[PDB]
Amino acid sequence: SISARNQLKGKVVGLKKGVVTAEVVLEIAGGNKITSIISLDSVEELGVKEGAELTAVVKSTDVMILA
Amino acid sequence: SISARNQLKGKVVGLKKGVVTAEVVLEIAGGNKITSIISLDSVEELGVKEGAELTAVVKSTDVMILA
Amino acid sequence: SISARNQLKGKVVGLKKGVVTAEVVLEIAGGNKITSIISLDSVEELGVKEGAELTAVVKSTDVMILA
Amino acid sequence: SISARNQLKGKVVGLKKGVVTAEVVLEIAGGNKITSIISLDSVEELGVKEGAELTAVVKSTDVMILA
Amino acid sequence: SISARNQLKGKVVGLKKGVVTAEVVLEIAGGNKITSIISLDSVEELGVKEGAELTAVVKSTDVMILA
Amino acid sequence: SISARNQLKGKVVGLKKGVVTAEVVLEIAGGNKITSIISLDSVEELGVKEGAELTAVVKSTDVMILA
Numbered sequence: 001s002i003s004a005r006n007q008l009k010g011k012v013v014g015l016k017k018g019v020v021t022a023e024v025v026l027e028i029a030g031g032n033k034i035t036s037i038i039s040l041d042s043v044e045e046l047g048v049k050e051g052a053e054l055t056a057v058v059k060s061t062d063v064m065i066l067a
Numbered sequence: 068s069i070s071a072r073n074q075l076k077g078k079v080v081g082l083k084k085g086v087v088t089a090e091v092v093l094e095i096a097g098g099n100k101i102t103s104i105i106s107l108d109s110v111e112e113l114g115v116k117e118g119a120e121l122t123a124v125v126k127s128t129d130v131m132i133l134a
Numbered sequence: 135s136i137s138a139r140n141q142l143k144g145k146v147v148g149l150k151k152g153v154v155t156a157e158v159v160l161e162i163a164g165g166n167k168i169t170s171i172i173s174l175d176s177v178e179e180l181g182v183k184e185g186a187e188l189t190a191v192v193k194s195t196d197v198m199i200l201a
Numbered sequence: 202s203i204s205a206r207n208q209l210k211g212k213v214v215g216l217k218k219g220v221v222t223a224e225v226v227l228e229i230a231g232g233n234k235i236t237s238i239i240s241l242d243s244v245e246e247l248g249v250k251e252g253a254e255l256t257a258v259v260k261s262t263d264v265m266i267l268a
Numbered sequence: 269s270i271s272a273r274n275q276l277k278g279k280v281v282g283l284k285k286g287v288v289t290a291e292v293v294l295e296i297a298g299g300n301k302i303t304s305i306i307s308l309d310s311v312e313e314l315g316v317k318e319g320a321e322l323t324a325v326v327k328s329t330d331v332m333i334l335a
Numbered sequence: 336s337i338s339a340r341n342q343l344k345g346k347v348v349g350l351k352k353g354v355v356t357a358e359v360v361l362e363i364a365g366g367n368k369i370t371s372i373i374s375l376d377s378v379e380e381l382g383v384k385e386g387a388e389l390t391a392v393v394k395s396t397d398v399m400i401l402a
């Protein structure tokens with residue numbers, strides 16, 4: 001598919017629409033919550049809604065380690 | 068406490084050291100695997116090693132939605 | 135301790151709250167000003183306020199060189 | 202100039218060349234150190250060298266707050 | 269000269285201002301379109317308007333590959 | 336469908352493998368060139384080779400504006 005190595009499946013538990021951006025919160029395995037801030041245009045075009053099953057995607061070079 | 072909203076606990080299952088960067092692979096809840104590319108310097112100062120328990124951190128503005 | 139190599143201490147001199155995001159401006163050593171755009175949620179959970187002493191954090195792979 | 206709001210002037214105190222990437226460390230005001238990981242091609246083309254006076258640049262959406 | 273390896277000349281065909289951020293859409297050579305989300309402050313300081321001729325800039329480490 | 340708003344079709348004209356990362360250069364429509372730095376693992380898993388027809392993908396929040 002795509003080079004981004006992090007692909008986490010989950011369900012939408014939160015949605016907040018802005019003017020330029022929008023926030024999507026997904027509940028994944030173990031009950032952890034992933035928060036995404038993307039364009040309002042993409043949220044609308046993809047038809048994001050509470051309860052939908054979507055996948056969070058993250059490029060490897062954007063992941064930090066806390067030790 | 069840091070603003071980055073995504074913080075996922077896991078165990079180190081893969082580690083590869085380059086010249087400038089290094090790759091850390093974490094196994095988190097549900098079997099999901101997180102891949103991180105960071106500086107070699109940080110991997111050495113943090114003492115990252117296979118089997119260690121660490122946390123992956125990702126800023127909300129870097130998470131995309133696939134669906 | 136986090137892998138992100140850039141950690142700069144400063145004082146909050148500007149704060150603007152949007153619908154989804156928020157802007158924090160920090161004055162660091164030498165008079166330099168750091169601008170951060172993060173989630174509104176994090177700005178509220180952290181209790182960020184003008185005059186507060188906080189730290190700006192930036193991952194090494196996000197820093198470019200101009201010259 | 203450019204939209205990236207963070208522009209920090211400094212002097213090169215460290216340089217490490219990889220195969221694909223390279224690390225540049227700059228000393229800025231207050232003695233803080235900024236670490237950048239960019240392409241080896243750009244380090245070579247810009248002629249980066251120990252002691253040179255350059256500027257570190259960071260997009261606002263890549264800056265986190267630690268409180 | 270900046271290290272960011274992707275520099276695409278274009279014309280502004282879309283501009284949407286928010287509270288904290290702003291969206292800029294550029295038409296570039298070959299019939300492609302680029303969408304940028306940056307600070308409202310930078311859009312105003314740069315004098316961005318529909319019809320302006322500007323350049324979109326992306327760091328190499330932020331570009332993914334889809335197959 | 337992914338939320339990333341920038342999707343540019345091209346042909347691979349350059350490939351350089353490192354230890355941890357890898358550099359891919361694509362020629363896109365209109366005579367523009369895109370440079371991507373991703374994981375070596377993804378380059379190998381995707382079967383990236385010179386001459387391949389692939390798509391470069393960038394999140395809107397990573398695109399700056401130069402005037």
Ligand SMILES: [Cl-]
Binds near residue numbers: 083
């Ligand atoms: Cl190794």
Ligand SMILES: [Cl-]
Binds near residue numbers: 151
């Ligand atoms: Cl406000």
Ligand code: NA
Binds near residue numbers: 062126129193196263
């Ligand atoms: Na980032």
